[PDB]
């Protein structure tokens, strides 16, 4: 039995029945504090080595550091039950062994809820949505995967993906398989290009992109490999490290959107 996940605004996330109109961006004004929640259902009798949530958001949403709260069945986790790392554009939250004990080997489905807020800022452009992207990276083996980090192309409209490969221990290995990625508009959600990295190559470039738009390369699941998207350092460059973790593909919830008008 697979875990299930949903992401939405406060009070609206529901993995069993995601919100029917979530495709429509919710209208906000610059300065609004927007409240989010990620709800995950973990099956009875789980034995995960890793339960990790990774969240990043587009530049018009300023992640509000210090606002992350996490509960299991509506009981707040103790500090030692999880490890949270917050960065400018989002966060990563992983259960420790103490936290895993509260969701593994249970006799009924367990519900994890993570809440936080972000602020709509003056980088937002009227009529153009802002969004976020989350993964639940899990498995019976340790998992090293996480969520895509959106990036703009360089000034010439070029965006280059560089890929490396390591085994479960983090040691370099040859490419495991041909790797396909969907380049998605990170704000609006549509696929703009699909690229393929053959096993004799480590880079691929997409040309002719909008230098003012944030995009993300989303790796199509490669059996036995998890995708570790590196932090962004440079417009026009995205790096991914594939780990041979031998785990199931991650969960990737449908995403809510916000927008502002003039």
Q: What is the CATH number of the domain that holds 174?
A: 2.60.40.1140
Residues after which the chain is discontinuous, using a C–N cutoff of 2.5 Å: none
**Do the beta carbons of residue 217 and residue 148 sit within 8 Å?**
yes
Distances (CA, A) of 203 to 15, 62, 64, 196, 211: 36, 31, 34, 10, 20
Region for residue 27 given its phi and psi (left: phi exceeds 0; alpha: psi -120 to 50; beta: otherwise): beta
**Same domain, yes or no, for 136 and 167?**
no
The 3-state DSSP class for residue 218 equals strand
Query: d(Cα 250, Cα 234) in Å, to the nearest integer?
Result: 26
Out of 86, 117, 149, pick the residue that ends a domain.
149
**Same domain, yes or no, for 159 and 124?**
no
**Same domain, yes or no, for 169 and 185?**
yes
**Same domain, yes or no, for 164 and 137?**
no
Out of 149, 166, 194, pick the residue that ends a domain.
149
Q: Which of 12, 62, 20, 51 is nearest to 135 (CA)?
A: 51
Task: Give the method of determination.
Answer: X-ray
**Same domain, yes or no, for 121 and 155?**
no
Region for residue 45 given its phi and psi (left: phi exceeds 0; alpha: psi -120 to 50; beta: otherwise): left
Out of 116, 149, 182, pick the residue that ends a domain.
149
**Same domain, yes or no, for 34 and 111?**
yes
Query: d(Cα 198, Cα 204) in Å, to the nearest integer?
Result: 9
- State the resolution, in angstroms: 1.3
Query: Domain range holding 67?
Result: 1-149
**Do the beta carbons of residue 3 and residue 44 sit within 8 Å?**
no
- CATH code for position 110: 2.60.40.740
**Same domain, yes or no, for 55 and 182?**
no
**Same domain, yes or no, for 86 and 166?**
no
Query: d(Cα 37, Cα 115) in Å, to the nearest integer?
Result: 4
**Same domain, yes or no, for 137 and 245?**
no
Query: d(Cα 80, Cα 140) in Å, to the nearest integer?
Result: 21
**Same domain, yes or no, for 22 and 113?**
yes
Domain count, the chain: 2
**Same domain, yes or no, for 180 and 225?**
yes
**Same domain, yes or no, for 133 and 159?**
no
> What is the largest distance, in Å, between two alpha-carbon atoms of the chain?
55
What is the 8-class DSSP label of residue 100? H
Tell the burial category of 158 from Cβ atoms under 10 Å away from its Cβ (0-12, 13-18, 19+). Answer: middle
């Amino acid at each position: 039995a697979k875990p299930k996940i949903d992401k939405d605004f406060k009070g609206k996330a529901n993995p069993d029945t995601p919100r029917v109109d979530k495709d429509t961006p919710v209208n906000h004004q610059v300065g609004d504090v927007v409240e989010y929640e990620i709800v995950t259902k973990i099956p009875a009798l789980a034995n995960y080595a890793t339960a990790n949530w990774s969240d990043r958001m587009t530049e018009g949403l300023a992640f509000n550091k210090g606002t992350v709260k996490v509960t299991v069945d509506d009981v707040a986790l103790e500090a030692g039950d999880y490890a949270l790392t917050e960065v400018a554009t989002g966060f990563d939250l992983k259960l420790t062994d103490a936290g895993l004990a509260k969701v593994n080997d249970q006799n009924a489905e367990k519900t994890v809820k993570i809440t936080y807020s972000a602020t709509l800022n003056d980088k937002a452009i009227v009529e153009v949505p802002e969004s976020n992207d989350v993964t639940f990276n899990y498995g019976n083996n340790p998992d090293h995967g996480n969520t895509p980090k959106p990036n703009k192309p360089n000034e010439n409209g070029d965006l280059t993906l560089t890929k490396t490969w390591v085994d479960a221990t983090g040691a370099p290995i040859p490419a495991g398989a041909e790797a396909t990625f969907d380049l998605v508009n990170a704000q609006a959600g549509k696929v703009v290009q699909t690229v393929t990295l053959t096993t004799d190559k480590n880079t691929v470039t997409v040309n002719g992109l909008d230098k003012n738009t944030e995009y993300k390369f989303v790796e199509r699941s490669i059996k036995g490999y998890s995708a570790d998207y590196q932090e962004i350092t440079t417009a026009g460059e995205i790096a991914v490290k594939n780990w041979k973790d031998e785990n199931p593909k991650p969960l990737d919830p449908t995403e809510p959107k916000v927008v502002t008008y003039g």
